[PDB]
């Protein structure tokens, strides 16, 4: 294939009016990349520089090759690296690199950008292997003072992409850091005339920070770099400042340990000074800097709480600076928007920062904030009163109970009075502030003196502007959550009134500013905390939601706009969520209405556009099944088609909820579940084997295996091997990336494996010969639990895992598995779980059981 033919393929792939020709071209391109990668890469690089080719085809050439060289998936990354190294000949490599460098200095910025990304991908492969030594010399020379602007900027882009494209948790660019910094800082320093170049340099520097540890450990280099960054924060151009402050914040987060001299000698004074800028963007920059400091010092405190002997040390920047920083933040609170728009601004950032200060510094925040509140809560300007309640609410988390209780008692009359303020913004924030008081120190509201006035303010507010009503629903949730646990609880005396008020807000005609949905959410809370003493109010909710569902189903949807229809769907979702909670909370009350409910649910399922609410319908059907037990069997024939269709819609979230139905009936049908188990297993085996399955399906299915095994017991043995294979495969799957999303997903998978093993060990309690060949596998998983804090720090996870240690031990008194019970990590894990006081007492009891059984195992 020639350059011209390849270019024609690319062009046709994106520009042909004929979709057939587009797909044919894409297939032929991928096929050449598979059959002759050397030629594919060479030709791609030649089209990149071919002026005779349309711009989009040249950009596409570069980006497609780039996407065959780097990936997010680490495994794909490694495969691409080895393919470049072994399958592209040295002469081909040299030609591709030369062509990419030619395109980098193109007068067309789109060509230059694509070329920069391609250069970055190749560099990410070669520099860690001590290759392409010419590149960094070219980059350093290219950002030299007398180079033209486009060459500087394109090269700085390439350096940024280089650092961003490398794995964050890697040493791939360490060996190049010196030259990277030279090239980057050359563009960042004050002598550089182009704002675009300084911006690109600072953004690249931010990208590079994770690769310059060795440089930051050198005092002279660290000093010079920090000097350049600070110089940039004082630059005249506001975008340059913004970029430099991004750098400063990232440096503080990554290299906190080195910041004390820079804080003392300059940054404290500088950032405090600019926090008073009349420009909201500048001030916002300084605010973000101090929020970063607070976040890091809170994280240090947390880590030292988990391990008192960790080397990390806080310098207490925030604590020492409160006197000088906090008054400026408070002043920023009066820069709200003169309505309604709700768009973010510096005043909201300053509020979040103030809350970080209070969490980090406790009682030290009180004096300046309380002074501001006193000065402004009765001011004539609505901005000052709103700022006052914002500040007061923002210090309710951090200080000790004595101080908070004292000042809540002192301020509650004025705060409740602000619920009658003429300013909508003031009332909105006042309702929020009452929620903050309730949420952190609910006992601060004296049951006789102020709780009736608090409840009354919430009830009036639910009838106010929807913005106020939403915050009143949130506040009611906080009140119930924080007061229900006390015995007696005062909040139950107000349950009828509260419920009545919430029903009224749920009966709003619209959901403007989320006031109606929020009310439904609070109703769910009311249900979940209801006691027998307020049984009647529970009944009131049940009656309301059932009737309400009926009402929504009288609405002719062919007279609705798209927006109208979305509103109706969200309302039906709110209703069905509360209804599911009602059904689960009082199973005895459900039988008489079961038929009617299913009649409605099937109707909802047969509606056109049922795909939008079918998830919530399945949640309610599952709750009804759980509550009726064997009484649900009469609906199974009619429900089966829907269930199977939902289970097979592996792309849609409805399949997850359908798995949740299986989980419910496995528990609620008792003996009667066995007659369906085989069919369920078959379906599930297909589902988890479907490549079109969304990721969230995998953990759900794993967990439900545990449910099934738990209820069918020995009937599970013929499936055991297959299921164990799945569990093993799942527990040995590394995170896809180092990103937070991949690690969190992996945690979900491991949690589901824990569910599976718990259910299996419970089900096979009497069949140790069936479990025996998997004990070591289970112990490998448990070791994973003991190693990763995202697992063992969770009370329920540790309770289940240490429970497995004990129960498995109890199943084998023959000593056939005693070899696992002498391991230091097992003993240590049992002891950490038994002693850690943030673990509940049920967890510690389970750890005791595990310790008894482990010691007995060593006795054998």
């Amino acid at each position: 294939m020639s350059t011209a033919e390849f270019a024609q393929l690319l062009e046709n792939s994106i520009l042909s009016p004929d979709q057939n020709i587009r797909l044919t071209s894409e297939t032929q391109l991928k096929k050449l990349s598979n059959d002759n990668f050397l030629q594919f890469a060479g030709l791609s690089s030649q089209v990149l520089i071919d002026e005779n080719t349309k711009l989009e085809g040249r950009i596409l050439a570069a980006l497609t090759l780039k996407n065959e060289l780097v990936s997010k998936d680490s495994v794909k990354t490694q495969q691409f690296a080895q393919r470049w190294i072994t399958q592209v000949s040295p002469e081909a490599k040299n030609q591709i690199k030369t062509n990419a460098l030619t395109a980098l200095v193109s007068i067309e910025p789109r060509i230059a950008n694509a070329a920069a990304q391609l250069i970055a991908a190749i560099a990410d492969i070669e520099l860690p292997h001590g290759a392409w030594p010419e590149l960094m010399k070219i980059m350093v020379d290219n950002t030299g003072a007398e180079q033209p602007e486009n060459v500087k900027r394109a090269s700085l882009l390439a350096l940024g992409y280089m650092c961003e494209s490398a794995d964050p948790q890697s040493q791939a660019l360490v060996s190049s850091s010196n030259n990277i910094l030279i090239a980057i800082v050359q563009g960042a320093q004050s002598t550089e005339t182009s704002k675009a170049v300084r911006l690109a340099a600072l953004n690249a520097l931010a990208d590079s920070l994770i690769f310059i540890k060795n440089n930051m450990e050198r005092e002279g280099e660290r000093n010079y770099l920090m000097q350049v960054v600070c110089e940039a924060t004082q630059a005249e151009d506001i975008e340059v400042q913004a970029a430099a402050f991004g750098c400063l914040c990232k440096i503080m987060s990554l290299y906190y340990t080195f910041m004390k001299p820079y804080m003392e000698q300059a940054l404290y004074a500088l950032t405090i000074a600019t926090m008073k800028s009349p420009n909201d963007k500048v001030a916002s920059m300084t605010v973000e800097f101090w929020s970063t400091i607070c976040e890091e010092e809170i994280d240090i405190a947390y880590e030292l709480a988990q391990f008192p002997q960790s080397p990390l040390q806080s310098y207490n920047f925030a604590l020492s600076s409160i006197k000088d920083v906090v008054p400026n933040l408070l002043n920023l609170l009066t820069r709200q928007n003169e309505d309604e728009d709700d768009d973010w601004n510096v005043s909201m950032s300053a509020g979040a920062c103030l809350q970080l200060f209070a969490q980090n510094c406790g009682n030290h925040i009180l004096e300046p904030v309380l002074e501001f509140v006193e000065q402004n809560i009765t001011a004539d300007n609505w901005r000052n009163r709103e700022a006052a309640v914002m500040a007061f609410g923002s210090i309710m988390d951090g200080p000790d109970k004595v101080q908070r209780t004292y000042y809540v008692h002192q301020a509650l009359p004025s705060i409740l009075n602000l619920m009658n303020d003429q300013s909508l913004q003031v009332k909105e924030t006042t309702a929020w502030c009452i929620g903050r008081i309730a949420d952190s120190v609910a006992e601060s509201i004296d049951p006789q003196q102020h709780l009736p006035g608090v409840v009354q303010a919430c009830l009036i507010g639910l009838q106010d502007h929807p913005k106020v009503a939403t915050n009143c629903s949130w506040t009611i949730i906080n009140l119930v959550e924080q007061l229900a646990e006390a015995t007696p609880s005062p909040i139950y005396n107000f349950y009828p009134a509260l419920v009545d008020g919430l029903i009224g807000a749920a009966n709003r005609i619209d959901n403007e500013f989320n006031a109606r949905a929020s009310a439904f959410s609070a109703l769910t809370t009311m249900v979940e905390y209801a006691t027998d003493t307020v049984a009647e109010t529970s009944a009131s909710i049940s009656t309301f939601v059932m009737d309400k569902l009926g009402q929504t189903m009288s609405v002719d949807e062919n007279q609705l706009t798209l927006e109208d229809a979305q509103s109706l769907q969200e309302l039906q979702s709110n209703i069905l969520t509360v209804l599911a909670a009602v059904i689960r909370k009082s199973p005895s009350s459900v039988e008489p209405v079961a038929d009617m409910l299913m009649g409605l649910f099937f109707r909802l399922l047969e509606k056109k556009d049922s795909a939008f609410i079918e998830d919530d319908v399945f949640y309610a059907i599952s709750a009804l099944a759980a509550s009726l037990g064997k009484g649900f069997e009469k609906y199974l024939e009619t429900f089966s088609p829907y269930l199977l269709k939902a289970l097979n819609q592996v792309d849609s979230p409805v399949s997850i909820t359908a798995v949740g139905f299986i989980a419910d009936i496995s528990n609620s049908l008792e003996e009667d579940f066995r007659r369906y188990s085989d069919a369920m297993m078959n379906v599930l085996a297909q589902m988890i084997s479907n490549p079109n399955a969304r990721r969230e399906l995998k953990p759900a299915v794993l967990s439900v295996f545990g449910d099934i095994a738990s209820n069918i017991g020995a009937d599970f043995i013929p499936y055991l091997n297959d299921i164990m294979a799945l569990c093993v495969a799942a527990q040995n799957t590394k995170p896809e990336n180092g990103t937070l999303e991949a690690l969190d997903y992996q945690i979900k998978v491991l949690e589901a494996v824990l569910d599976a093993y718990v259910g299996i060990v419970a089900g096979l309690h009497d069949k140790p010969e069936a479990l025996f060949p998997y004990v070591g596998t289970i112990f490998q998983f448990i070791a994973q639990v003991a190693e990763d804090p995202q697992l063992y720090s969770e009370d329920a996870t540790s309770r289940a895992a240490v429970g497995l240690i004990g129960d498995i031990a109890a199943m084998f008194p023959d000593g056939s598995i005693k070899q696992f019970y002498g391991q230091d990590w097992v003993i240590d894990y049992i002891k950490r779980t038994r002693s850690g006081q943030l673990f509940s007492q049920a967890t510690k009891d389970t750890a005791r059981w595990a310790r008894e059984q482990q010691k007995r195992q060593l006795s054998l």
Binding site: L181, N223, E264, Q265, A266
Partner: peptide, 29 residues
């Protein structure tokens, strides 16, 4: 005195004076 004692007089010359990144980074000077 290993405590945070900031100055109200900022000075960002942590080391106008001429300075090259090439003379700093990797320079060991």
């Amino acid at each position: 005195n290993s405590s945070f004692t900031p100055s109200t007089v900022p000075n960002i010359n942590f080391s106008t004076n001429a300075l090259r990144p090439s003379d700093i980074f990797g320079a060991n000077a």
